[PDB]
Amino acid sequence: MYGQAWNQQGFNQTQS
Amino acid sequence: MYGQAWNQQGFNQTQS
Amino acid sequence: MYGQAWNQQGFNQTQS
Amino acid sequence: MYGQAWNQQGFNQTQS
Amino acid sequence: MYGQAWNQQGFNQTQS
Amino acid sequence: MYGQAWNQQGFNQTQS
Numbered sequence: 001m002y003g004q005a006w007n008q009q010g011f012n013q014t015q016s
Numbered sequence: 017m018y019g020q021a022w023n024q025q026g027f028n029q030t031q032s
Numbered sequence: 033m034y035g036q037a038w039n040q041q042g043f044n045q046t047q048s
Numbered sequence: 049m050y051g052q053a054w055n056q057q058g059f060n061q062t063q064s
Numbered sequence: 065m066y067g068q069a070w071n072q073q074g075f076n077q078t079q080s
Numbered sequence: 081m082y083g084q085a086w087n088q089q090g091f092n093q094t095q096s
Contacts, residue, residue: 003021
């Protein structure tokens with residue numbers, strides 16, 4: 001590989 | 017591979 | 033491969 | 049309305 | 065409205 | 081509205 005790779009497992013915005 | 021690859025498992029926006 | 037490949041398993045927007 | 053509605057204009061994965 | 069609505073305009077993963 | 085709404089314009093992972 002010659003690049004960049006994230007793995008965003010989250011992003012969450014919970015309520016109640 | 018000569019590129020970039022994420023794997024976003026999340027994105028979630030839960031409520032209640 | 034000479035490119036970029038994600039696998040987005042999520043996207044979800046749940047409610048209740 | 050009693051629900052939830054996104055409008056995802058993107059999704060794009062461009063190359064070159 | 066009684067819910068939740070995003071508008072994701074992006075998502076992009078450009079190269080070169 | 082009785083909820084939560086983001087607008088993620090970004091997400092980008094550029095290269096070169």
